């Protein structure tokens, strides 16, 4: 077992959110995919098989989904179709993605609170925060 599994396997649904669309206006998803992944209520899929990690994100607007090892660079193609280098690891307890693009940088990161997963988005003093439980 692993502090990672403990916190974080599972499937999580998303209960709120809070600024989002700025977020989503920093890092510059256009108006027509902002108001339709806006309205998303994604599921969150986390899994762990020996180094390799999952994170799926389902919903009406999209299905994505990555695989990676902590530490170590992958290319990812993002919901908003940025090509971002991403790079994730564990500080702490909170699982700490980065993505680069284009001179440009944003981290998401993942935290347990209590009986909630919080995803807490930041670009450029924008932070959106998305809670997600169990489902
Ligand atoms: O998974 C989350 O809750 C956290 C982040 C997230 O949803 N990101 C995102 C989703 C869809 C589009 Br389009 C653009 C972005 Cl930046
Ligand atoms: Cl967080």
């Not at 999580?12 to 510059?28: A, H, Q, R």
């Not at 098989?49 to 992958?74: A, C």
């Not at 807490?120 to 439980?133: D, L, Q």
């Amino acid at each position: 077992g692993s502090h990672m599994c403990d916190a974080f396997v599972g499937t999580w649904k998303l209960v709120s959110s809070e600024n989002f669309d700025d977020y989503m206006k920093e890092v510059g998803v256009g108006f027509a995919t902002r108001k339709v992944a806006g309205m998303a209520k994604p599921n969150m899929i986390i899994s762990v098989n020996g180094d390799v990690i999952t994170i799926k994100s389902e919903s009406t607007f999209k299905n994505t989904e990555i695989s990676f090892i902590l530490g170590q660079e992958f290319d990812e193609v993002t919901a908003d179709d940025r090509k971002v280098k991403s790079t994730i690891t564990l500080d702490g307890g909170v699982l700490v993605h980065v993505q680069k693009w284009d001179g440009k940088s944003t981290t998401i990161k993942r935290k347990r609170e209590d009986d909630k997963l919080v995803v807490e988005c930041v670009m450029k003093g924008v932070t959106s925060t998305r809670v997600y439980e169990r489902a």
